Amino acid sequence: ALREEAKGLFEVIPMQAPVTRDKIDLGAMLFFDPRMSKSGVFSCQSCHNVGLGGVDGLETSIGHGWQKGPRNAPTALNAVFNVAQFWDGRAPDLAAQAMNNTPENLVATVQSMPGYVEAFAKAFPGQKDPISFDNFALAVEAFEATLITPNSKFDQWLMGADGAMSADEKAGLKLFIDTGCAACHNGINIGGNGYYPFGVVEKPGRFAVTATADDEYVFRAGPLRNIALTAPYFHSGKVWDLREAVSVMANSQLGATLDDTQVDQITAFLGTLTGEQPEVVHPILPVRSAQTPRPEH
Amino acid sequence: ALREEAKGLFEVIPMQAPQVTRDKIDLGAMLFFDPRMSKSGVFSCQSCHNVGLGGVDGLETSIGHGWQKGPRNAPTALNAVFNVAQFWDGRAPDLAAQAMNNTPENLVATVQSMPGYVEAFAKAFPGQKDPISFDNFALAVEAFEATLITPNSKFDQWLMGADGAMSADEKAGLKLFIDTGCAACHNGINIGGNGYYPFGVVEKPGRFAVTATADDEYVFRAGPLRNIALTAPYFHSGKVWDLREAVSVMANSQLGATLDDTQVDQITAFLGTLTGEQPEVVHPILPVRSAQTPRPEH
Ligand code: HEC
Ligand code: HEC
Numbered sequence A: 001a002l003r004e005e006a007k008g009l010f011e012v013i014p015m016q017a018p019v020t021r022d023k024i025d026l027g028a029m030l031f032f033d034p035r036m037s038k039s040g041v042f043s044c045q046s047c048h049n050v051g052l053g054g055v056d057g058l059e060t061s062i063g064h065g066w067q068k069g070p071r072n073a074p075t076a077l078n079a080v081f082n083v084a085q086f087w088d089g090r091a092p093d094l095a096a097q098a099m100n101n102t103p104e105n106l107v108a109t110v111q112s113m114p115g116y117v118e119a120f121a122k123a124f125p126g127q128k129d130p131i132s133f134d135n136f137a138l139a140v141e142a143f144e145a146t147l148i149t150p151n152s153k154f155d156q157w158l159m160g161a162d163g164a165m166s167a168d169e170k171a172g173l174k175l176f177i178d179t180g181c182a183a184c185h186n187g188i189n190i191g192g193n194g195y196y197p198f199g200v201v202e203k204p205g206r207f208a209v210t211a212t213a214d215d216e217y218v219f220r221a222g223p224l225r226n227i228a229l230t231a232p233y234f235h236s237g238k239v240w241d242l243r244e245a246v247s248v249m250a251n252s253q254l255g256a257t258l259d260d261t262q263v264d265q266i267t268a269f270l271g272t273l274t275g276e277q278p279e280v281v282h283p284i285l286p287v288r289s290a291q292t293p294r295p296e297h
Numbered sequence B: 001a002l003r004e005e006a007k008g009l010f011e012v013i014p015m016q017a018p019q020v021t022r023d024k025i026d027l028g029a030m031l032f033f034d035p036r037m038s039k040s041g042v043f044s045c046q047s048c049h050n051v052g053l054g055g056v057d058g059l060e061t062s063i064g065h066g067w068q069k070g071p072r073n074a075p076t077a078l079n080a081v082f083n084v085a086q087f088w089d090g091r092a093p094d095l096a097a098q099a100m101n102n103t104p105e106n107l108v109a110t111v112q113s114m115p116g117y118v119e120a121f122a123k124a125f126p127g128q129k130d131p132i133s134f135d136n137f138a139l140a141v142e143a144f145e146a147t148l149i150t151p152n153s154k155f156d157q158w159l160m161g162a163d164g165a166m167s168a169d170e171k172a173g174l175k176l177f178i179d180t181g182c183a184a185c186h187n188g189i190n191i192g193g194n195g196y197y198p199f200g201v202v203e204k205p206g207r208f209a210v211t212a213t214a215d216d217e218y219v220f221r222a223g224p225l226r227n228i229a230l231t232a233p234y235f236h237s238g239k240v241w242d243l244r245e246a247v248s249v250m251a252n253s254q255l256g257a258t259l260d261d262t263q264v265d266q267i268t269a270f271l272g273t274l275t276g277e278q279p280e281v282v283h284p285i286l287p288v289r290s291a292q293t294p295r296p297e298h
């Protein structure tokens, strides 16, 4: 019954997200290559650490031009299923929207390595110039599709394991749904679908939720899957305790009066969204050449 | 014959270094890949000793150890366990006895604060009132590091009898390397990483040169050349990016001898012969943090 209701609001993470191999292998390399960053110190992996729930464990960091400022890095895990992929911005901008190393540099970098040259060859069989920014992205994309975490306790229960979750955890599921959370944090990723004119801020609880300066400016209701592994929380990454994050959100213009037990249960439910982490072998990155652009410095 | 001579100056990398001994490696892997072991929470050993980048960070310099005398080019972790001289430079005396922020207190605390690390240390060290001690912490990391060895390089193969594992040029580079005097400092199982010398490559206001240190008391380590083809840039400053040039600035110095273009090319050709099979390493799943886990810097 509750499952019937839950089934109407969420989806489970599939065994595998919807060349292919060499396409993934190329992506893995690019994803783990720090030379793809202007400074040569950051690789996707650095901030979307596959060993840390696909995050960097820091309050904030900066790695994309679109970024509106230092933001808490979201997990790469299951990120492929997100329809809303940004933290914040003006609604119009974000709708049409969906650091330094220009596509020129990237292509050059990749271009400069024999390993990458043959790697792109395998990944894209009949192209005269398989080394193109677009393919570069597609490859990384392929790999990212690999970073999914199926079989979370929640997914198990959703599929029928009446005993996959505890009483409290189910109570948290009901309260989560009933309290209004699911209205923004839904979908296969329990979030990552839409933006809202709200953001959590620290006061000079130490944090509150306040409307954006303009209703047109919005923040993304992030995917809660694996959240137990992606601390700190909120765009600022200032709240480190999951229980408190649930709390600052429950007790706000967004949720409703919730008691300590109730809060505890929703957060208990949230821990239920941690899925089996991808086992990823660190790829052996191709050797650099004299033509390979040197790191920032 | 040349092999007989080479066999007297170097050793091949073993299939496995001479090291629970599994639960220790696994624990080491985690610590090695855990960025929370750094004060700022952004650097893990892996960050600067990237197992995908010949165990280096690919930067001119970086800073990650208290003993460091200043920004230095990060050496590969690969085969590092076989090095007897493990520092870049310093005063001979200091270095003899000697062998960033997060104090051993913090580390132990950090590890201590995670249930995963607690059970991981348990498996790694079956007996102890507190298996979670800085010493064990190091021992575990050490265990893993012993895993980061690159055997079967073309050179090792040839040393083991494969007359055809190396090319003519590469063998010429081996003879030149030996004959020119390189092997005098760059020898051992790692073709270096054994001793320090009163010389350092400095950028001239070639564009670099081997200069004697201010005082012969102060010395720089003749680093291991294995996998060097993968560990650019070169020298303590990490200012030379081309291997061929590194060979050159060193050949054309008091440490080397007069080598022409082909000779230099051959020595550098030989050096590429030291790249061994890279360790296939699965990125470990780091244990989750707790409320007691020290928060990152900032
Ligand atoms: C130095 C930090 C940093 C690096 C390096 C970095 N990222 Fe990110 N990434 C972030 C931050 C911060 C965000 C979220 C901020 C925002 O959207 O405003 C993010 C978000 C993302 C997202 C969207 C997540 C979601 O849930 O929709 C993807 C996909 C992503 N990064 C991919 C990559 C890839 C691929 C690379 C390597 C080319 C990379 N990142 C490198 C910091 C980084
Ligand atoms: C009006 C829309 C809305 C509703 C309803 C809502 N949220 Fe959110 N939630 C957001 C937005 C927007 C963010 C991100 C903004 C930020 O980080 O400041 C967010 C972020 C979060 C985060 C942080 C996730 C992370 O990865 O850091 C948690 C936890 C959360 N919400 C829990 C809940 C819970 C529990 C409820 C129900 C009591 C709820 N939310 C209801 C809009 C909503």
Ligand code: HEC
Pocket: B032, B037, B038, B043, B044, B045, B046, B047, B048, B049, B061, B062, B063, B064, B065, B067, B068, B069, B071, B072, B073, B074, B075, B076, B077, B080, B083, B085, B086, B087, B088, B089, B141, B193
């Ligand atoms: C931010 C940079 C940085 C980080 C993080 C870092 N290292 Fe290093 N490491 C270096 C540099 C630079 C050197 C060489 C400098 C010197 O010796 O003066 C080095 C050298 C070493 C060496 C000796 C190499 C040899 O060939 O003898 C070992 C072993 C080592 N690091 C282990 C580690 C371990 C284990 C960690 C994690 C606890 C780690 N490093 C983290 C920068 C770093």
Ligand code: HEC
Pocket: B177, B180, B181, B182, B183, B184, B185, B186, B196, B197, B199, B200, B201, B202, B220, B221, B222, B223, B224, B225, B228, B231, B233, B234, B235, B236, B237, B246, B247, B250, B251, B252, B255, B256, B257, B267
């Ligand atoms: C007198 C001792 C000595 C002799 C002889 C010597 N080297 Fe070195 N070599 C060093 C020292 C010390 C360093 C490191 C100092 C620095 O980086 O400035 C070094 C560094 C190097 C490096 C850089 C390694 C790296 O990882 O960055 C290369 C390459 C090198 N030597 C090649 C050679 C070659 C080729 C010869 C023979 C022509 C040779 N060396 C002879 C002392 C010596």
Ligand SMILES: [Ca+2]
Pocket: A055, A072, A073, A074, A230, A231, A232, A233, A234, A237
């Ligand atoms: Ca977070």
Ligand SMILES: [Ca+2]
Pocket: B056, B073, B074, B075, B231, B232, B233, B234, B235, B238
């Ligand atoms: Ca180097």
Ligand SMILES: [Zn+2]
Pocket: A235, A236
């Ligand atoms: Zn903010």
Ligand SMILES: [Zn+2]
Pocket: A260, A261, A264
């Ligand atoms: Zn409570």
Ligand SMILES: [Zn+2]
Pocket: B200, B201, B202, B236, B237
């Ligand atoms: Zn210097």
